[PDB]
């Protein structure tokens, strides 16, 4: 229905944040004597992943996984990882954590493959809607309960290509 | 190079599956919850087809395809089409030996939190057991012989045989 | 809603038909100097495939493919074939052809892989609802416009395990 | 064994993509129909991320993963999430040379009958062309050098590099 997108987080603010995020992930896994892999969750994480891994100055791998989401459904794997994660630095890259329902199950599935380390990096965070206690090691921004778009996040499959995070305001 | 002779004839398979049908039927009789049989593609499609026709309990038929240093992949190429949360789930497989695949598969499905979770296998090689995995319904216990037929293949062959045969090499 | 399943095609009639179907597929590909593969379409074709290939007295392969269906959507591939079909006797095994919409696109996709021969075998057929002219080389039964169940075919994911084809009658 | 030196620096990539953004924008300006960019996973995720941010036309971002005697597989491991029928579809890929994958992919997507169907590639090796496939938008034309970076890998490595580099062997 009739809406309007207003700039919430400018392109410059995201670039600086990701710069620091990558400048937080680097010294974490700087001396780990094991291979590293970033796992992005399709579909709306491709832009976050692309910008983050370019700031991660650690020789790693980049993989993807498309999972269905809990919401109360079962978390199914539509597209699994290509490479293996057993004994590897796995860093789950998510665009937004509101409920934590989906991500909790994703982490549980990957944990079955027994990686050396398993962490989560998210760009946006809605603690306002948190339903499941799930540990997040890296958070870009903690945001209000606003329906956001841009930077991978969609609204009716739209606005994914926006270089900034915007809020949706229904014309009423 | 090879030839194939019959180990477990078609008639003997039908008799065993008929017995398996009765066992599974009484176990999940008067359970109340929904039931679903999950087959592990590919070589379990035939076993599933004959087994589910012997299970006289209103159940669903779902499928799943898994992939194969210690357990290289066990990825999910094709996940289930339906939910299993709060249902009675019976995993249908043709062969169990090392227990690698069934162990991880049971773990993955356990995360969806079904009411019950059992395993029904057509064949079983107890000698190759690397991982102790609980199996309730076993069709046949066989020695470490390489077998084919009834869904089981050798280099993509003999999947359509109505019997379980052995591969002798020349 | 409240319904009742009545026997339409008994188990004996199907077994005899499949016996003849396999006794129609065998002498077709009896002397073909190329590998053969049966392609079943998940999910409701597993029972048909299992019984048919046991009557096909020709050394072949058995593969599966899960496709989304046209209905007006795009036919997408949820699960593709494991093995290749280029230069092989491909026989698409379907449980029911009502519109032909889905199967037409499935055949087009497989045809791109350039097999030697490409045919279709179906158990049930509803010419009453045929929307797309699609050549079917093997038909088990031509049926009325009755909502059928059993033998792989479902109704709200039910009745798949039935050894017979049954019709659904709504209690009114 | 190896080392990696820069061929196409980060700055040069951004400048080229900026130019590509304007070209694609005018081509699909005042088209009316819906637009969608289809990326070929994996090594096109970064290119897609930077390219779609330069395309100033309301479009969708979909993805697809394909597999690789003549064209052994070209199976679809992960199909698109949305329909493309009656839409303007632009295939986004990193490297084109043999033209094997792009040819079949274009064929598969053509069956869904979109309004238009074009291809945008980051790199191009015209020397290895086995199949003549139409490509409208090309980022860089390079000789037959094995390159990495910007999504492109060598044994699952260097995918995260912000630049296009060459692999020299020792
Ligand atoms: N379009 C949109 N705008 C929002 O502000 C929003 N918040 C949550 N969601 C979706 C809920 N969803 C958040 C992430 O899913 C988004 C699907 P993706 O963008 O394809 O990755 C729950 C997953 P979780 O349990 O791990 O937190 C939103 N979607
Ligand atoms: N094709 C074949 N023939 C055999 O005689 C055999 N014995 C063990 N295996 C191992 C295959 N088996 C895989 C069974 O999954 C279905 C794949 P398909 O047998 O190729 O159709 C592993 C059981 P595990 O997880 O307990 O080790 C055999 N495979
Ligand atoms: N449950 C049920 N009962 C029916 O009598 C019936 N007729 C068509 N359909 C579904 C329509 N559908 C028929 C086959 O799809 C059934 C899904 P499957 O059982 O998982 O294979 C159109 C495909 P087509 O374009 O190739 O003919 C039915 N479903
Ligand atoms: N990794 C890599 N590095 C190269 O320098 C290269 N040159 C050609 N190719 C061929 C790979 N290329 C596949 C590109 O798809 C993305 C897979 P990814 O490059 O491993 O991320 C085939 C293009 P074609 O269908 O025209 O033959 C290369 N691959
Ligand atoms: Mg996400
Ligand atoms: Mg069907």
The CA–CA distances, whole Å, from A49 to A90, A158, C120, D50, D56 equal 13, 19, 44, 12, 21
From C172, C157, C151, select the one nearest C4 (Cα to Cα): C172
Say if C51 is an interface residue toward chain B (CB within 8 Å): yes
Interchain contact D80–C (C-beta under 8 A): yes
3-state secondary structure of D32: coil
CA distance C32 to C39: 18
Q: Which residues pair with C93 in a beta bridge?
A: C40, C121
Which candidate from B72, B76, B112 shows the least CB-CB separation from A74? B112
Tell me if C165 sits within 8 A of C43, measured CB to CB: no
User: How far is residue A49's CA from residue B34's CA, in Å, rounded to a whole number?
Assistant: 41
Structure tokens at D99: 């033209």
**DSSP 8-state secondary structure symbol assigned to residue C5:** E
A166's tokens? 């915007």
Q: Which residues of B touch A84 (CB under 8 A)?
A: 72-73
Cβ contacts below 8 Å, chain A against chain B, sum to 33
Q: What is the DSSP letter of D121?
A: E
Which residues, other chains included, contact C28 with Cβ-Cβ below 8 Å and sequence gap of 6+?
C119
Instruction: Give φ, ψ of B104 to 5 degrees.
Output: -70, -40
d(CA A84, CA B67): 12
Nearest CA in chain A to D157: A61
Distance CA D159, CA D165 (A): 11
Q: CA-to-CA distance for C81 and C65, rounded, in angstroms?
A: 5
Neighbours of A28 (CB within 10 A): 17
Among A63, C141, C54, D9, smallest CA distance to B162 is for C54
The total domain count for chain C is: 1
Do B154 and B145 touch, CB atoms closer than 8 A?
Answer: no
Residue found by looking up tokens 């094709």 in the block: B78
Of residues B102, B96, B168, B101, the one with CA closest to residue B138: B96
Contact status, residue D140 vs residue D151, Cβ threshold 8 Å: no
Structure tokens at A97: 């954590």
The radius of gyration of chain B from alpha carbons, rounded to an integer in Å, stands at 16
Which among D60, D76, D78 is positioned nearest to D68, based on CA atoms? D76
User: Phi, psi (5° rounding) for residue B31?
Assistant: -90, -35
Cβ B99 under 6 angstroms from ligand 2: yes
The whole-angstrom separation of Cα A156 and Cα A171 is 17
- Give the residue from D143, D153, D150, D146 showing the smallest Cα distance to D169: D146
Under 8 Å CB-to-CB from B110, ≥6 apart: which residues? B117
CB of D39 closer than 6 angstroms to any ligand 4 atom: no
- Measure the CA–CA gap between D116 and D122, rounded to whole angstroms: 20
Whether residue A69 contacts residue A101, with contact meaning beta carbons closer than 8 Å, is answered with yes
Instruction: Closest CB to D46: pick one of A43, A50, A56.
Output: A50
Strand arrangement of the beta sheet that strand B59-66 belongs to = B76-78, B59-66, B35-41, B88-96, B116-124, B137-141
d(CA A97, CA A140): 11
List the catalytic residue out of D34, D62, D94, D97. D97
Question: A130: closest CA among A142, A148, A120?
Answer: A142
Q: For residue A56, what is the domain's CATH number?
A: 3.40.50.2020
Mind giving me the DSSP string for chain A? --EEEEEEE-HHHHHHHHHHHHHHHTTTSSS-SS-EEEEEESSTTHHHHHHHHTT--S-EEEEEEEE---------EEE--SS--TTSEEEEEEEEESS-HHHHHHHHHHHTT--SEEEEEEEEE-GGG--S----SEEEEE--S--EEBTTB-SSS-STT-SSEEEEEE--
CB A86 within 8 A of CB A115: yes
Residue D112 touches chain A, beta carbons under 8 Å:
no
Those residues whose C-beta lies under 8 Å from the C-beta of residue C152, and which sit 6 or more positions away, are B61, C43, C44, C45, C46, C47, C48, C95, C160
Ligand 1 centroid from CA A96, angstroms: 6
Structure determined via: X-ray
Instruction: Using the mean position of ligand 3's atoms as its centre, give its distance from the Cα of residue B156 in Å.
Output: 29
Q: Which residues surround ligand 6, an ion (CB under 5 A)?
A: C 41, 94-95
Closest of A171, A172, A170, A168 to residue A6, by C-alpha: A168
- Looking at ligand 4, which residue's alpha carbon is closest to its atom 17? D43
Region for residue A81 given its phi and psi (left: phi exceeds 0; alpha: psi -120 to 50; beta: otherwise): beta
Q: Which of B97, B124, B144, B153 is catalytic?
A: B97
DSSP sequence for C67-119: E---------EEE--SS--TTSEEEEEEEEESS-HHHHHHHHHHHTT--SEEE
Q: What is the largest CA-CA distance in chain D?
A: 54
User: Percentages helix, strand, coil for chain B, rounded to the nearest 5?
Assistant: 25, 35, 45
> Contact, A52 vs A121, CB < 8 A?
yes
**Catalytic one of A51, A98, A145, A154:** A98
Chain C interface disruption, residue of D82, D83, D106, most C CBs within 10 A: D83
Which residues partner with D167 through β-bridges?
Answer: D4
D94 is catalytic: no
- Determine the distance separating the centroid of ligand 4 and the alpha carbon of D64, expressed in angstroms: 15
Strand partners, D60: D36
DSSP classification of residue D96: E
Residue found by looking up tokens 């969806």 in the block: B112
Q: Which two tokens stand for residue C166?
A: 């049954």
> What's the sign of the alpha-carbon dihedral B139, B144, B150, B151?
positive
What's the rounded Cα separation, in Å, for the pair A29 and A43?
A: 26
Distance from the alpha carbon of residue C66 to the mean position of ligand 6, in angstroms: 9
Region of C129 (left: φ > 0; alpha: ψ -120 to 50; beta: rest) is: alpha
Does B77 contact chain A (CB < 8 Å)? Answer: yes
C116 is written with which tokens? 């030697």
Residue A139 CB contacts under 8 Å (≥ 6 apart), including other chains: A121, A122, A125
Q: How far is CA D140 from CA A111, B112, D41, D46, D95, in A?
A: 41, 47, 19, 16, 10
Q: How far apart are alpha carbons D51 and C37 in whole angstroms? A: 42
Could you list the beta-strand ranges (E) of D22-148. Answer: 35-41, 59-66, 76-78, 88-96, 116-124, 137-141, 147-148
Written as one string, the DSSP assignment of B46-100 is: HHHHHHTTT--S-EEEEEEEE----S----EEE--SS--TTSEEEEEEEEESS-H
Supply the DSSP symbol for D5: E
Nearest Cα residue to D156 out of D5, D68, D73, D43: D43
Q: Nearest 5°: CA angle at D134, between D129 and D135? A: 90
SS3 C133: coil
User: Shortest CA distance to B66 belongs to which of A121, D154, C82?
Assistant: C82
Question: B17: Cβ below 6 Å to ligand 2?
Answer: no
| β-pair partners for C125 | C97, C142
Taking an 8 Å cut-off on Cβ atoms, the answer to whether A62 and D42 are in contact is yes
Domain range enclosing C39: 1-172
Residue C138's closest CA among C94, C169, C101?
Answer: C94
Q: Which atom of ligand 1 is nearest to the CA of A97?
A: 27
**A118 Cβ under 8 Å from any chain D Cβ:** no
Long-range contacts of A97-100 (CB under 8 A, 24+ apart): A97/A122, A97/A124, A97/A125, A97/A126, A97/A130, A97/A134, A97/A136, A98/A126, A98/A128, A98/A129, A98/A130, A99/A70, A99/A71, A99/A129, A99/A130, A99/A131, A99/A132, A100/A130, A100/A131, A100/A132, A100/A133, A100/A134
């Amino acid at each position: 229905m009739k809406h309007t997108v207003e700039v919430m987080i400018p392109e410059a603010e995201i670039k600086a944040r990701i710069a620091e995020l990558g400048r937080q992930i680097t010294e974490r896994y700087k001396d780990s004597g094991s291979d590293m892999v970033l796992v992005g969750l399709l579909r709306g994480s491709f832009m976050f992943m692309a910008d983050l891994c370019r700031e991660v100055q650690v020789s790693h791998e980049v993989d993807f996984m498309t999972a269905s989401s809990y919401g109360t459904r079962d978390v199914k794997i539509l597209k699994d990882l290509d490479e293996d994660i057993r004994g590897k630095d796995v860093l789950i890259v998510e665009d937004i954590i509101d409920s934590g329902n989906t991500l909790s199950k994703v982490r549980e599935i990957l944990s079955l493959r027994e990686p050396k380390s398993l962490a989560i990096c998210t760009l946006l965070d809605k603690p306002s809607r948190r339903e499941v206690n799930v540990p997040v090691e890296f958070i870009g921004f903690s945001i209000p309960d606003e329906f956001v778009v841009g930077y991978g996040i969609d609204y009716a499959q739209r606005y994914r290509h926006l270089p900034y995070i915007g809020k949706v305001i229904l014309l009423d």
